[PDB]
Coordinates of N, CA, C and O in Angstrom, one line a residue:
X22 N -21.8 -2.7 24.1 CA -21.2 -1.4 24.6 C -19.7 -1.6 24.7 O -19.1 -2.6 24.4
X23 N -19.0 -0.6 25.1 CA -17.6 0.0 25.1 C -17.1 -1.3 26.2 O -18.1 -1.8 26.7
X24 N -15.9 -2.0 26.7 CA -16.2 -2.6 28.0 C -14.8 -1.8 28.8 O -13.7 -1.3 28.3
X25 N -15.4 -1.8 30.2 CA -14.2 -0.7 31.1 C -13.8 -1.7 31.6 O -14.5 -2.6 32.0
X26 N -12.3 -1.6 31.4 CA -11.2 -2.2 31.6 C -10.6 -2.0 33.3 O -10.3 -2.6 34.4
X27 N -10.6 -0.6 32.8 CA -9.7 -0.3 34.1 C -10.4 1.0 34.4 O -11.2 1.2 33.5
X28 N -10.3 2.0 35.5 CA -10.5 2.9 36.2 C -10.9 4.4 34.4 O -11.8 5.2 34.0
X29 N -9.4 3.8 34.1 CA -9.4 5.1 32.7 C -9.3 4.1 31.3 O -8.6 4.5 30.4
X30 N -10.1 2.8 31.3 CA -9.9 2.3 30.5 C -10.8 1.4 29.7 O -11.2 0.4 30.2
X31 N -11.2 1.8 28.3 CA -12.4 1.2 27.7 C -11.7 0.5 26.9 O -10.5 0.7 26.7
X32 N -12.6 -0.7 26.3 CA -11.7 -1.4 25.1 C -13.5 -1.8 24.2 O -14.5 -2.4 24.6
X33 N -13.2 -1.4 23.1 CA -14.4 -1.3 22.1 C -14.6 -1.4 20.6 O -13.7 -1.9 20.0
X34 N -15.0 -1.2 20.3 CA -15.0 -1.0 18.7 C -15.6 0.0 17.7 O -16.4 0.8 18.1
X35 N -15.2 0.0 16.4 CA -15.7 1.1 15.8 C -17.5 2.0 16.0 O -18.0 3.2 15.9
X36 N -17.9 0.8 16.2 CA -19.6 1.4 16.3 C -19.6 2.4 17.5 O -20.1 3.5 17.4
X37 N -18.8 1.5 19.1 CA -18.9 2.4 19.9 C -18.3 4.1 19.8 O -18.9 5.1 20.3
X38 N -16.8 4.2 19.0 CA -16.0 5.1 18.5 C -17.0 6.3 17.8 O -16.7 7.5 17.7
X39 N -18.2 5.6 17.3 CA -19.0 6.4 16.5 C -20.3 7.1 17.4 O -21.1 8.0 17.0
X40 N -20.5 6.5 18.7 CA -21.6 6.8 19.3 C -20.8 7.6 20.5 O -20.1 7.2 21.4
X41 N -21.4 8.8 20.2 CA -20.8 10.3 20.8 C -21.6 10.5 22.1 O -21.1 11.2 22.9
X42 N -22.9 9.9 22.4 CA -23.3 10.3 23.6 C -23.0 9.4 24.5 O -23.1 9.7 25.7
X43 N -22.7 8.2 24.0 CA -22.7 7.4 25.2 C -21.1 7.3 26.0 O -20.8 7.1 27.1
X44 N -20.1 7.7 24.6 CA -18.7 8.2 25.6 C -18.5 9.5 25.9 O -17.4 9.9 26.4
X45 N -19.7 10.5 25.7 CA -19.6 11.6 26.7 C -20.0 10.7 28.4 O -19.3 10.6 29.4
X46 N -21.0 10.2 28.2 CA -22.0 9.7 29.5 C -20.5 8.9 30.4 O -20.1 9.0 31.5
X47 N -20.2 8.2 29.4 CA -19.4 7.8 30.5 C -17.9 8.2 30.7 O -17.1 7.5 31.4
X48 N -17.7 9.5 30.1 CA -16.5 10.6 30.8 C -15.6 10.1 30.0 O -14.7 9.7 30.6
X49 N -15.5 10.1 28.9 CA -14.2 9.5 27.8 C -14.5 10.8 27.5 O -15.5 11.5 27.6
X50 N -12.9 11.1 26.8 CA -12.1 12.6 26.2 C -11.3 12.0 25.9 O -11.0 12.5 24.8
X51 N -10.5 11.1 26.1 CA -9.4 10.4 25.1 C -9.8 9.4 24.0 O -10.9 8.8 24.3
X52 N -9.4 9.1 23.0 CA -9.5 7.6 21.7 C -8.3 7.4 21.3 O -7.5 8.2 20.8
X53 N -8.4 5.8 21.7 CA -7.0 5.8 21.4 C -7.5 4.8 19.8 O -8.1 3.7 20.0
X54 N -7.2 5.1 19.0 CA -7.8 4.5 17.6 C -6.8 3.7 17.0 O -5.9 4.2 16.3
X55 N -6.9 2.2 17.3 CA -5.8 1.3 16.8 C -6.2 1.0 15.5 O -6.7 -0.2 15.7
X56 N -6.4 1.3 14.2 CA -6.3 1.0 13.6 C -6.0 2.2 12.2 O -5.9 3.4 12.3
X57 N -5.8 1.5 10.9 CA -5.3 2.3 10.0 C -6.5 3.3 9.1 O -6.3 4.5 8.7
X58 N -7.6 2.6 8.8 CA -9.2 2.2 7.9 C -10.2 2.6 8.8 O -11.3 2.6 8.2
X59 N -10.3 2.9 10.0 CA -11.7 3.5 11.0 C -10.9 5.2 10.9 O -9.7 5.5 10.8
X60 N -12.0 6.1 10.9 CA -11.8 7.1 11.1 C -11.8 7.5 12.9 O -12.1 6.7 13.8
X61 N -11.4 8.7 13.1 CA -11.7 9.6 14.2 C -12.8 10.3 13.9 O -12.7 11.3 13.2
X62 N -13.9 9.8 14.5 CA -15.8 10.1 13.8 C -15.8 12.0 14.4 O -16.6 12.8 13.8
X63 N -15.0 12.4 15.4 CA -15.4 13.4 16.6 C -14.0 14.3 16.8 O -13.5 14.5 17.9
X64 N -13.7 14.6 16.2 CA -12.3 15.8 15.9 C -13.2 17.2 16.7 O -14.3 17.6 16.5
X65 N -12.2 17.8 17.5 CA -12.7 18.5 17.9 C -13.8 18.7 19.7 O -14.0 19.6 20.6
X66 N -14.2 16.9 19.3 CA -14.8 16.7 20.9 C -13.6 15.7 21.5 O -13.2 15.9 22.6
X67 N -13.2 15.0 20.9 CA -11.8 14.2 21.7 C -10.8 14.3 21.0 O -10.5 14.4 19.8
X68 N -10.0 14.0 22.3 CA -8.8 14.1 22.0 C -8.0 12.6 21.3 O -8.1 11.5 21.8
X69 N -7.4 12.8 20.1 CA -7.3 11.4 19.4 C -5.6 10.8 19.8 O -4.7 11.5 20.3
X70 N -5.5 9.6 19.5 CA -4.2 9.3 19.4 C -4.6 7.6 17.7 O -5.5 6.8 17.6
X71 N -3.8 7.7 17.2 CA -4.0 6.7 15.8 C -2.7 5.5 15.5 O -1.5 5.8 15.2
X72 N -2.9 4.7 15.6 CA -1.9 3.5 15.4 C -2.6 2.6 14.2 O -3.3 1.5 14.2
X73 N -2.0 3.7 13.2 CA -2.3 3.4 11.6 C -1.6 1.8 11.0 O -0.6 1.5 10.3
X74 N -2.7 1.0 11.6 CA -2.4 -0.6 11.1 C -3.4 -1.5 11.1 O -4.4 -1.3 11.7
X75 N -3.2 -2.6 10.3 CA -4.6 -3.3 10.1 C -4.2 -5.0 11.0 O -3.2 -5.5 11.5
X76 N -5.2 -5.4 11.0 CA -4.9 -7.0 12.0 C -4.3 -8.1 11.2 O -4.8 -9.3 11.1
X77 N -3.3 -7.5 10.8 CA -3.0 -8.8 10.3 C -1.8 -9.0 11.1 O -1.3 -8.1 11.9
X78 N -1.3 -10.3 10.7 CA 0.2 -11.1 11.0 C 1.3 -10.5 10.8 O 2.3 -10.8 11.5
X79 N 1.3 -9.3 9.7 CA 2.9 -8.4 9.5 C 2.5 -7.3 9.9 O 3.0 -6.3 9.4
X80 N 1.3 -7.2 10.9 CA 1.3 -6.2 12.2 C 2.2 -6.2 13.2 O 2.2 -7.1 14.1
X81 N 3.0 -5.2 13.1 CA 4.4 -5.0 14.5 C 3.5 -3.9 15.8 O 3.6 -2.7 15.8
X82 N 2.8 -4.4 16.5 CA 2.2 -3.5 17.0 C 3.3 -3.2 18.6 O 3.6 -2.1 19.0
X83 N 3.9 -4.6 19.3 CA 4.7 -4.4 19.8 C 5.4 -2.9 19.9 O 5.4 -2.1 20.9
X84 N 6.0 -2.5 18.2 CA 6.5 -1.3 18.1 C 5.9 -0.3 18.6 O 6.4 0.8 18.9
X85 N 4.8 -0.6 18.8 CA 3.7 0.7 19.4 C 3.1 0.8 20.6 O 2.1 1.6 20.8
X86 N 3.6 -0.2 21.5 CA 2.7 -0.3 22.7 C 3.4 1.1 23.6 O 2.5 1.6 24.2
X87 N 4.7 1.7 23.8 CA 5.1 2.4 24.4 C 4.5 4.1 23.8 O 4.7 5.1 24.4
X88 N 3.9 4.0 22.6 CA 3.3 4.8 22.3 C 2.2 5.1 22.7 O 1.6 6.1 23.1
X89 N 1.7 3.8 22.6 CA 0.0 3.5 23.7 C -0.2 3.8 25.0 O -1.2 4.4 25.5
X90 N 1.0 3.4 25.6 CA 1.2 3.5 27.2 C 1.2 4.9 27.3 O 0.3 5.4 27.9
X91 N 2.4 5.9 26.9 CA 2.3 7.3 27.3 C 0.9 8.0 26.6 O 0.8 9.0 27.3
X92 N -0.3 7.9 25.7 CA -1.5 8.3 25.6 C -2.1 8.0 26.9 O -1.8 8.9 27.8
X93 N -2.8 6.9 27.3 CA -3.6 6.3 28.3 C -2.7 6.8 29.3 O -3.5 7.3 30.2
X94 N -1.6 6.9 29.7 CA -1.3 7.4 31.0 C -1.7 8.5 30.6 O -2.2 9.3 31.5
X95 N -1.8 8.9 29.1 CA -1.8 10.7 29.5 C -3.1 10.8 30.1 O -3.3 11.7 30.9
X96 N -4.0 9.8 29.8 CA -5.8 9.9 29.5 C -5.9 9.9 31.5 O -6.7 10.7 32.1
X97 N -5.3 9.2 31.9 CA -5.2 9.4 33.5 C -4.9 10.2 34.1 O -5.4 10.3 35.2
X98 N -3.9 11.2 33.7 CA -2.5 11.9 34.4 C -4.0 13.0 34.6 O -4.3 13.3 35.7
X99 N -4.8 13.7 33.3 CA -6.0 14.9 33.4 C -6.9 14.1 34.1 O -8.0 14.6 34.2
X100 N -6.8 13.1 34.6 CA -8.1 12.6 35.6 C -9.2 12.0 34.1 O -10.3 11.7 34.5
X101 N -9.0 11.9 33.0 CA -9.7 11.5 32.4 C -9.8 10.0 31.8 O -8.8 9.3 32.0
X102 N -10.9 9.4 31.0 CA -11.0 8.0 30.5 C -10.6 7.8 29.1 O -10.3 8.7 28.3
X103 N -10.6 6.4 28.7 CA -9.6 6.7 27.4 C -10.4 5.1 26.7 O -10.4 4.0 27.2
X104 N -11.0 5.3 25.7 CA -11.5 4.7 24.6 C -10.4 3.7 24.0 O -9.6 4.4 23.5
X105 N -10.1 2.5 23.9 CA -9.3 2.0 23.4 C -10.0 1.1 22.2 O -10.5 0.1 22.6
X106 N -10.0 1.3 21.0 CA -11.2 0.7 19.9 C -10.4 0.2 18.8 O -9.3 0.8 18.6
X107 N -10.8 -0.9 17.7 CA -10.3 -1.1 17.2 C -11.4 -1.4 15.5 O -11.8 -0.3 15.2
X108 N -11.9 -2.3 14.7 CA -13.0 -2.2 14.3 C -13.9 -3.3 15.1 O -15.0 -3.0 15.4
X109 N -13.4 -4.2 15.4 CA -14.1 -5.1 16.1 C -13.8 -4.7 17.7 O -14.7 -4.5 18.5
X110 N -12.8 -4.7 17.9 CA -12.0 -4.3 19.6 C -11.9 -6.1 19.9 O -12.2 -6.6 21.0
X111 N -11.6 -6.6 19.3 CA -11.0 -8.1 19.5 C -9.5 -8.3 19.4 O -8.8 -9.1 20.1
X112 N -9.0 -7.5 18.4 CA -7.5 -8.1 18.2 C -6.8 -6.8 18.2 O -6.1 -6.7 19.2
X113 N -6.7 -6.0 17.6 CA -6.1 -4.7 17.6 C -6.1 -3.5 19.1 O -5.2 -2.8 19.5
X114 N -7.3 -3.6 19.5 CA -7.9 -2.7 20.4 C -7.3 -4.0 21.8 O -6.4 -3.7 22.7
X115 N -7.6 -4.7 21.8 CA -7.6 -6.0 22.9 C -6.3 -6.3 23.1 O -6.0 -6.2 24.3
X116 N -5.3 -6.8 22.3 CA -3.8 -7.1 22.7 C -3.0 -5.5 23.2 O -2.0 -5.4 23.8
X117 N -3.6 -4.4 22.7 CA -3.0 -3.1 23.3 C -3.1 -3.0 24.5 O -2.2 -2.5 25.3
X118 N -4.5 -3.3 25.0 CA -4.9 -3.6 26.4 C -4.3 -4.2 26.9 O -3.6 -3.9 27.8
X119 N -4.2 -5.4 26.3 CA -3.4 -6.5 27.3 C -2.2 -5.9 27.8 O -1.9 -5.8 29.0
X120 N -1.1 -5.2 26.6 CA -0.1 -5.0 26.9 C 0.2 -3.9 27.9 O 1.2 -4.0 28.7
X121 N -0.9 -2.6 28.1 CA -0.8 -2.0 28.8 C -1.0 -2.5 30.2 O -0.1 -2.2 31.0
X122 N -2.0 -3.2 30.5 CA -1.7 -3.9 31.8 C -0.8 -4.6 32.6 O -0.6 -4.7 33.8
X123 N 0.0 -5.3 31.2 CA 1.3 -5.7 31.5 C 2.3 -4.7 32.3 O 2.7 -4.6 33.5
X124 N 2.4 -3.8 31.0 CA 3.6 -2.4 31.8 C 2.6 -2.0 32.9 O 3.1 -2.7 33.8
X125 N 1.9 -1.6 33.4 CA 0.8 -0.8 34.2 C 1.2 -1.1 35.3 O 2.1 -0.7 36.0
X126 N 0.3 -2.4 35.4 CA 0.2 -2.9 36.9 C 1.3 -4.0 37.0 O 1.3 -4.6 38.0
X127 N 2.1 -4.2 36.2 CA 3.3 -5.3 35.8 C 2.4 -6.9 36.2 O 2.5 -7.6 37.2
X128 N 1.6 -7.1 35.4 CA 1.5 -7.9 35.3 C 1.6 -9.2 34.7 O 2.0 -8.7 33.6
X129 N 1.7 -10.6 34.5 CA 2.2 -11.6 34.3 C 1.2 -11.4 32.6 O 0.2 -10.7 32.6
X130 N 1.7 -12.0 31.6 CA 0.5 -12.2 30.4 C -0.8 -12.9 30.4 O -1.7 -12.5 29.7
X131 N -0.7 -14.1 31.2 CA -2.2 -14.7 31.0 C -2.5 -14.0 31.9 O -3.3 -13.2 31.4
X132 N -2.4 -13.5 33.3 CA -3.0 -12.8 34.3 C -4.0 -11.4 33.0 O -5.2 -11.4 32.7
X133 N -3.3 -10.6 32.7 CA -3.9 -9.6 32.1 C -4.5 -10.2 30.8 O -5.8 -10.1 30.7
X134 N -3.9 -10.6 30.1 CA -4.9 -11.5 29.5 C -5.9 -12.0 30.1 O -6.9 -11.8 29.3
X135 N -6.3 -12.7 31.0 CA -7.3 -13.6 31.6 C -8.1 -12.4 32.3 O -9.3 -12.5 32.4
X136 N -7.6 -11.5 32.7 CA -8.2 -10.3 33.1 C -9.5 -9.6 32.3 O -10.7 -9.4 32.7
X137 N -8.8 -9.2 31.1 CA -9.5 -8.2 29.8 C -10.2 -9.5 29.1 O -11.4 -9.4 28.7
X138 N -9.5 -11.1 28.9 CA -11.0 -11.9 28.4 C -12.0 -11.9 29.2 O -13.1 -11.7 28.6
X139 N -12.0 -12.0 30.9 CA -13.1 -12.5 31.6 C -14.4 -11.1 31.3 O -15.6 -11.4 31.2
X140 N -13.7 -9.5 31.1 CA -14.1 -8.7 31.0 C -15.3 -8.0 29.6 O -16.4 -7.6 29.5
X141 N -14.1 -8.3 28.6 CA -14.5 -8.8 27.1 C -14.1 -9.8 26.4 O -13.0 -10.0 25.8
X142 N -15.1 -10.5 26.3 CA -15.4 -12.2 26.1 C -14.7 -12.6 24.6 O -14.2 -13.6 24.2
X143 N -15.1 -11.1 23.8 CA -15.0 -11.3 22.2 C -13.3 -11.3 21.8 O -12.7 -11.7 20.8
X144 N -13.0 -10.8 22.9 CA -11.4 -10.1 23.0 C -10.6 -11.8 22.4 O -10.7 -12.8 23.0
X145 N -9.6 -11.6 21.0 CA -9.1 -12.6 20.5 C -8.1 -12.2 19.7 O -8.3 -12.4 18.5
X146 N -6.9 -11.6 20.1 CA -5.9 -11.0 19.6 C -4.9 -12.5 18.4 O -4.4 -13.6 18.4
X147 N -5.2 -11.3 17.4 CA -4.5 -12.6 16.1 C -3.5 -13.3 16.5 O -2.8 -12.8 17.4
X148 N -3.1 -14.6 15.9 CA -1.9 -15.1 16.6 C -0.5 -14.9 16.2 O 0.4 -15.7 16.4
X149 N -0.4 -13.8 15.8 CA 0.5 -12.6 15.7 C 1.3 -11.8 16.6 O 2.5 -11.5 16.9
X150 N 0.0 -11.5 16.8 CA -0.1 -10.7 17.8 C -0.6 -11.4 19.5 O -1.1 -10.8 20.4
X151 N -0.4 -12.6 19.3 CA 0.0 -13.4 20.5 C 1.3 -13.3 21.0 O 1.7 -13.1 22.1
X152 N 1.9 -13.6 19.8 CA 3.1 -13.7 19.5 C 4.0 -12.5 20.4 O 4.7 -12.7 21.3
X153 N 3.7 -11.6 19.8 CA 4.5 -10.9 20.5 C 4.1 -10.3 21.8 O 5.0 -9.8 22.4
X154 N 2.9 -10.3 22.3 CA 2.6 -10.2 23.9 C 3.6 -10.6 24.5 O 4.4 -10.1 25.3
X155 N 3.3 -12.0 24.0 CA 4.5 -13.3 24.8 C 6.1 -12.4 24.7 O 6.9 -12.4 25.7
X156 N 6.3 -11.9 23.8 CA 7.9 -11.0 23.6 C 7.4 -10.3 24.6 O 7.8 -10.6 25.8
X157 N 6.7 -9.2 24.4 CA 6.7 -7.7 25.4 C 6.7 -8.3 26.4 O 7.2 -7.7 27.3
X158 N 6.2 -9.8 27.0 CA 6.7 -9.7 28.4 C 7.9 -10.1 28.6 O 8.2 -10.1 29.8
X159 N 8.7 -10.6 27.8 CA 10.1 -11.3 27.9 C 11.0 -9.8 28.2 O 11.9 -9.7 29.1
X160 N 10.6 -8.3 27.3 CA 10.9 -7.6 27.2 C 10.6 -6.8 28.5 O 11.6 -6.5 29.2
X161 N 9.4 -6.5 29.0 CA 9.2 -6.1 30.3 C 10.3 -6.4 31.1 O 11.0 -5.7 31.8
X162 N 10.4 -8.1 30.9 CA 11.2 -8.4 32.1 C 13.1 -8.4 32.1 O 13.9 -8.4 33.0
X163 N 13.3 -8.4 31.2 CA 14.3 -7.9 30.4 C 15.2 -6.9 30.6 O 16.1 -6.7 29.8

């Protein structure tokens, strides 16, 4: 299944992105769809947001987490939940999480990290995109 992160926050993968009853059931209206190659299965029942990129190493996702953050806040601000998926939800969908936690609750990186692994086990952001967590928090703090 999808795994809930936070109050408005799932982190999952394409299969879940594709199974329409079980994120009505559990009150998702937002998707936030990190990747380039998975579609938006549900146009028209949610609301999308797209961060057209694939998992590799000359992924700048960094560049995109402030884009991430104002979505998912928006997915809260309507009182609503927010799908965060990627195809697996390991590395693309998972280090967006992390970073959102970071800005969110200003959290330290292994803290939110150690947070979203204990939650989702599969969660294993490329080491790329390790990489730059470790930046966005230099940058947070910055």
């Amino acid at each position: 299944s999808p795994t809930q992160i936070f109050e408005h926050v799932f982190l999952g993968s394409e299969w879940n992105a594709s199974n329409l009853e079980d994120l009505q059931n559990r009150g998702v209206r937002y998707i936030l769809n990190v990747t380039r190659e998975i579609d938006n299965f549900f146009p028209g029942v949610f609301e999308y947001h797209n961060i057209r990129v694939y998992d590799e190493e000359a992924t700048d996702l960094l560049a995109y987490w402030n884009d991430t953050y104002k979505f998912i806040s928006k997915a809260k601000k309507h009182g609503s939940k927010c799908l965060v998926h990627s195809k697996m939800g390991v590395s693309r969908s998972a280090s967006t999480v992390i970073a959102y936690a970071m800005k969110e609750y200003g959290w330290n990186l292994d803290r939110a990290y150690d947070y979203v692994k204990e939650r989702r086990t599969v969660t294993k952001p490329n080491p790329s995109f390790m990489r730059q967590l470790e930046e966005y928090q230099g940058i947070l703090l910055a």
